[PDB]
Amino acid sequence: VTKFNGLTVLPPLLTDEMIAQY
Amino acid sequence: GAISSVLNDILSRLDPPEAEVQIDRLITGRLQSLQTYVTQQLIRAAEIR
Amino acid sequence: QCVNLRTRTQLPPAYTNSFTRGVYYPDKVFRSSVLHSTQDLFLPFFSNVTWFHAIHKRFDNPVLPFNDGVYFASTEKSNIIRGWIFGTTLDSKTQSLLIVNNATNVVIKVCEFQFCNDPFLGVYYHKNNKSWMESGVYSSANNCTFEYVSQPFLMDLEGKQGNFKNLREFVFKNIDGYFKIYSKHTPINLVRDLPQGFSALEPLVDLPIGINITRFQTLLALHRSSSGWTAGAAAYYVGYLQPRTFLLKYNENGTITDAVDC
Amino acid sequence: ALDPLSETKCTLKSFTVEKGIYQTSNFRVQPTESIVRFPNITNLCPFGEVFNATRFASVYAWNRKRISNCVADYSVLYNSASFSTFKCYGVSPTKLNDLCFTNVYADSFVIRGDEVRQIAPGQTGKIADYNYKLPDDFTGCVIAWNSNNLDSKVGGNYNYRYRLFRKSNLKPFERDISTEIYQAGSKPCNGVEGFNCYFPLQSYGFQPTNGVGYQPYRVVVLSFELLHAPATVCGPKKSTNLVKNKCVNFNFNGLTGTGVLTESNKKFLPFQQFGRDIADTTDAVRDPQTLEILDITPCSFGGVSVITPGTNTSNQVAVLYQGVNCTEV
Amino acid sequence: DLCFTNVYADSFVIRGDEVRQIAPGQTGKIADYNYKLPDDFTGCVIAWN
Numbered sequence: 082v083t084k085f086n087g088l089t090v091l092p093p094l095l096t097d098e099m100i101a102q103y
Numbered sequence: 104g105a106i107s108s109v110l111n112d113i114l115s116r117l118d119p120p121e122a123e124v125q126i127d128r129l130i131t132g133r134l135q136s137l138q139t140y141v142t143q144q145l146i147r148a149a150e151i152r
Numbered sequence: 153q154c155v156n157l158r159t160r161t162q163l164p165p166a167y168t169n170s171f172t173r174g175v176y177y178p179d180k181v182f183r184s185s186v187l188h189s190t191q192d193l194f195l196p197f198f199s200n201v202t203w204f205h206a207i208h209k210r211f212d213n214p215v216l217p218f219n220d221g222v223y224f225a226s227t228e229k230s231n232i233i234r235g236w237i238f239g240t241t242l243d244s245k246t247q248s249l250l251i252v253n254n255a256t257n258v259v260i261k262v263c264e265f266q267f268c269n270d271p272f273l274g275v276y277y278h279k280n281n282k283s284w285m286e287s288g289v290y291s292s293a294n295n296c297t298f299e300y301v302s303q304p305f306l307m308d309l310e311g312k313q314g315n316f317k318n319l320r321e322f323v324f325k326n327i328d329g330y331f332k333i334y335s336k337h338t339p340i341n342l343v344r345d346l347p348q349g350f351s352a353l354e355p356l357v358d359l360p361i362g363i364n365i366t367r368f369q370t371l372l373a374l375h376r377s378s379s380g381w382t383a384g385a386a387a388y389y390v391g392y393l394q395p396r397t398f399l400l401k402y403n404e405n406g407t408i409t410d411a412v413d414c
Numbered sequence: 415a416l417d418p419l420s421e422t423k424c425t426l427k428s429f430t431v432e433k434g435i436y437q438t439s440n441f442r443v444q445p446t447e448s449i450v451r452f453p454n455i456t457n458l459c460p461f462g463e464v465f466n467a468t469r470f471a472s473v474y475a476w477n478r479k480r481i482s483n484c485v486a487d488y489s490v491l492y493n494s495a496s497f498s499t500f501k502c503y504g505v506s507p508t509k510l511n512d513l514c515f516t517n518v519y520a521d522s523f524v525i526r527g528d529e530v531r532q533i534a535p536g537q538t539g540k541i542a543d544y545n546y547k548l549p550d551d552f553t554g555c556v557i558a559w560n561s562n563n564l565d566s567k568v569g570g571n572y573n574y575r576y577r578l579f580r581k582s583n584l585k586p587f588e589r590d591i592s593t594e595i596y597q598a599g600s601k602p603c604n605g606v607e608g609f610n611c612y613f614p615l616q617s618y619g620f621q622p623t624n625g626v627g628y629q630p631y632r633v634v635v636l637s638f639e640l641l642h643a644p645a646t647v648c649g650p651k652k653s654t655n656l657v658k659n660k661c662v663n664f665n666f667n668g669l670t671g672t673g674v675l676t677e678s679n680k681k682f683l684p685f686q687q688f689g690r691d692i693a694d695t696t697d698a699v700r701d702p703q704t705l706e707i708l709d710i711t712p713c714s715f716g717g718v719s720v721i722t723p724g725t726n727t728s729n730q731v732a733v734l735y736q737g738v739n740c741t742e743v
Numbered sequence: 744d745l746c747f748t749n750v751y752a753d754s755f756v757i758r759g760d761e762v763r764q765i766a767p768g769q770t771g772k773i774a775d776y777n778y779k780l781p782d783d784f785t786g787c788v789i790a791w792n
Contacts, residue, residue, distance in 0.1 A: 084693055085712055089737055111670045115513060116640055118506045119782070120768040182682060182689035182698065355685055360480070360517060362587075406681045495772040507770065 104128045153268035153288040155378045159211045167200040168346055170391065174223055175398065175411045176323060176334050176353040183402045189414075191397040193325060195223050197413040199391070203345060206232070206372060206386035213270070213372075215242075218365050221393035224322035227342060230373075231309040231318070232386035234273045237369035238324075242267050244292065247363045249331075252371065255284045255307050262361055263296035274374035274381040284309055288378060289371070298361060309373075316342045321353055325393070329362030345387075352408040418720045419731045433723045441738065443714040445672060449664040450654050452514065453702040459484035459647065464522050464634060465491070465557075471523045473545045474577045474615065475591050482517045484647050486510070491557070498631065499530055502555035505640065511649030514667050518647070519637040521546075524565060524574060526618070528627040530558050533635070542584070544577045544614075549586035553640045558633040562622055565630040571620035579614040641668045644687055656701075661713035666699050673712035675699075682707055751786075762790060 105128040107113055113125045174195030201223070204212040216222075218238075226233055235258070239248035244264040252259060252273070271289035275282070312318075319342075323334040334353035341348075370388070374381040401410040415421070422436050423429060459481050471477055488510040491497075525533075525541065532539025533556070535548040565571060579596040595603060599610025607613070620630055645667050661674045669688065678698055682689075689698035699708050716738035722731040735743065757765075757773060764771030767784035774780075 085715065086693075086695075089715075089717070091736070112641060115509075115670070116506060117504075118768070118770075180685065180687055182686045184680065184689070186692055354683075362478075406683070 104132070153291070153378055156270050157211070157272065157381065157383075158379050159209055159383060161210055163204075163210065163212055166203050168203050168389075170195075170199060170201040170346075170389075171348070172197060172350060172411070173225070173321070173347065174323075174391075175350075175400075175408060177355065177408070178400075182406060183400075184406050185404045186402050187399065188402070189397055189399050191395070193221060193327070193393050193395050194398050195391060196394050196396060201225075201389050201391040204388050204390065206383050206388075208382050208385065211372070211383045213369065215367055215369070216390060218368050222322075222324050222368060223391035223393065224324065224388070225320070225391075226322075226386070226388040227316045227319040227340070227347070228386055229316060229318060230311050230384075231307065232373045232384045233320075233388070234371040234373050236324075237267075237271065237371065238365050238367075239265075239267075239369070240364055240366045242367065247296070247298070247361075249361075249363070249365070250290075252286065252289075253307070254286050255309065256304055258302045260298070260300040260302075260359065261293070262298035262363065263293040265290045266292045271369070271371065272374055272378075272381060273371050274376055276376050278377060284373075300359065302357070316340070319347060323353060323393075324368070326361070326365065330358055330360050332358050350410065417731075418733050419722065419729060422720050422722065429725075431722055431725045435719050435721055435734070437717060437719050439718050441714055441716045441718065441735075443661065445662040446660060447657060447662055448654065449657065449662055449666075449675075450512075450651060451656075451664075451666050451702055452648070452651055452653065453646075453667075455483065455485055455647070457484040459486050459518075461487075461491075464520055465632075467522065469573065470632065471521075472575045473523045473525055473541065474575045476521050476523055476546065476589065479520045479522065480517060481520060482646055486518075486647055486649055488649055497557055497559040499556070499558035499633075504553050505555060507555070512651055512665075513640065514645035514648035515638045515640060516643045516645050516647075517638065520634055522634050524561070524618075524630050524632055525576070526627065527560070527625075527629040527631060530631050530633055544580040544584070547584055547586065548635075552637060554636045554638055556633065556635050558631050560629055561632045562624075562629040565632070566620035566622045566624070568621070570618070571630075572617045574618045574620075575615050576618065577614050578616055579612060664699070667702060669696060669699060671696055671710060671712075672714070673710045676709045676711065678707040678709050759792075 105113070105125045106117075107125075110126070110129070113122055117125065174197075176194075178190045178192040206212065224236075235251035235253050237248070237250055240246055242248065244266045246264075247262050248265045248267070250259075250261045250263070250265055252261075267290055268288055273287060273289065275284065317339040319338055319340050321334070321336045323332075325332055333356045335356045336351055336353040338349070338351050372383050372386060374383050376382065397414045399412040399414065400408055401412075403409045418438070419431075421438055422431055425438055426436065464479070492507050492510065529539070529541055533541050533546070533548070535550055535552045538547075541547070579598075580590070581594070581596060584590075593615070595605045595611050596614060597603060597611060601609060601611075603609075603611035618630070619628075656675070658675050661672060663670065663672050664675070682698075687700045688696055691697050695710075697710050699710060701708070717736040719734045719736055720731060721734055755778065761771075761773050764773045765778070765780065765788060767780040768782055771779075
């Protein structure tokens with residue numbers, strides 16, 4: 082699988098390392 | 104429907120009797136773009152639910 | 153001046169197929185690796201462009217219009233084109249434009265030029281000190297305020313062997329009075345009367361004259377060892393523009409790479 | 415307006431705050447200095463041959479004058495009310511000194527007192543149907559002053575002419591100086607004086623004893639575009655040195671923004687003044703004086719959230735800044 | 744039928760060329776030096792030769 086006029090992207094709570102441990 | 108697309112273009116050229124007319128056509132045109140984006144993101148959240 | 157040259161003959165309107173050349177920069181804004189569309193006065197793709205020539209018993213110098221724009225393309229070897237003539241009614245009634253290069257500077261003279269029946273620039277004095285000097289085009293010009301001179305350069309007019317490596321492309325258009333001129337020089341490998349490749353034109357000069365122009369003309373470099381001269385070896389083309397939109401594919405360097413007709 | 419604990423209470427509208435996170439406001443980074451820049455020009459525009467001329471041109475046989483590459487003192491003729499008619503609709507007349515334009519197009523002529531009001535964009539009249547009318551994109555306004563004491567002669571100033579009749583309608587920015595006769599009736603006059611064929615050229619009967627509707631007015635229309643191209647002529651502004659590594663408000667011949675100014679490291683063309691991205695925002699700015707190209711990157715970003723426990727337990731709170739590196743803060 | 748708190752009566756004198764220059768938000772010769780009206784002008788004008 083594959084802008085600064087008030088737009089923002091929030092990071093998720095569960096990262097990619099904690100999903101693979103579940 | 105305004106004279107320009109830049110808020111600094113209308114403010115630095117026109118008079119404040121006229122500047123309240125062209126800005127009103129820009130706030131109304133840009134508020135409908137946000138109401139379409141929020142409503143479309145709210146229906147897409149129901150598919151991912 | 154009043155007597156037409158010996159080489160006047162009627163020629164049939166033969167045409168060829170211009171494939172993809174004729175794309176230019178429509179705005180002054182820099183882009184990088186984007187795909188942007190622009191509605192501008194462009195040349196259509198895969199259209200019929202008129203083929204003209206010039207030899208020592210044929211010469212094509214007609215009176216052609218200016219309403220749909222001129223796409224001027226010429227490939228030469230010894231710089232036989234000595235400029236252009238732009239005008240509306242071709243006398244001293246209104247403003248007429250004149251382009252003549254003296255191999256150091258191109259001058260832009262917009263005055264009330266009184267033209268003859270057929271203008272010519274003949275090159276003589278074959279013994280020594282040629283210098284391609286200025287010489288039966290007009291007789292009188294006055295009551296004008298438009299004078300302009302360009303930057304100095306040094307352009308060659310000698311006889312070179314091999315393939316036709318001096319290909320010149322020109323676009324003349326005046327929107328809102330601003331007469332803009334595009335130019336691009338690229339060496340090509342000519343096979344039979346047509347170029348191939350992809351190269352965009354760059355702007356040269358933009359002057360706000362503001363004169364209604366309906367016709368145009370060019371000047372040739374003649375030779376002689378009114379009717380006593382004889383024209384040289386040259387070839388040129390002339391087309392028309394149409395207001396159609398196009399696509400402009402940019403690269404990482406910041407120039408036009410490809411274009412798709414809409 | 416004192417602490418972030420009570421600042422959450424003006425958003426949630428409550429005196430007891432449940433634990434969690436709450437978005438309150440955003441950042442606002444102040445700029446320090448203003449950057450202005452204009453190319454070096456010292457010439458004065460030919461205003462003496464426009465307003466202070468003895469004789470003028472005619473409205474029938476007008477000639478548009480071009481003026482460029484100078485500086486315009488618009489604080490002597492626009493401040494002083496030494497003119498009879500001066501109204502302005504599209505340009506604010508108080509601040510022509512800092513906005514810059516490419517070229518001004520002036521037409522010096524005279525008309526009567528009943529003809530200075532009927533010249534307007536989109537409004538018809540005796541000038542707007544046969545002599546001259548303005549298009550819809552006209553940006554500018556007019557200077558008009560009464561001149562009955564000097565232009566009017568005792569026997570009639572017959573140096574000036576104007577048109578009465580025209581067989582067709584005007585299109586904008588065109589000159590018609592043809593002497594073709596008008597055919598109003600069915601008989602072909604073919605340029606000969608007769609019935610229903612009148613001579614459209616008429617001289618002015620300028621006399622100082624006439625009415626105010628026929629009094630002569632020294633008028634001039636001025637046409638110029640506002641921020642459509644790289645500009646050449648504007649008023650007496652002052653220069654300011656270039657400051658880097660700080661986000662400020664820059665004014666590069668009208669291109670106004672707010673952001674840091676770093677050096678550019680990409681390919682550019684000698685006939686390119688600015689660069690834009692896919693989002694149609696300015697990314698690079700050409701310097702009018704030096705041969706340098708800068709980069710545009712904005713500041714004043716990020717959101718502010720307040721992490722707090724319940725107010726029933728304690729009152730120690732914290733604050734989290736969203737998505738901003740706090741080395742600058 | 745509609746009444747207000749305080750009527751501010753301000754009397755002065757001008758010429759006949761200055762009667763159009765007194766307007767809310769309009770720049771004029773009488774406005775920049777002597778008497779201008781703001782955007783909150785609520786009233787009107789009585790004049791006589």
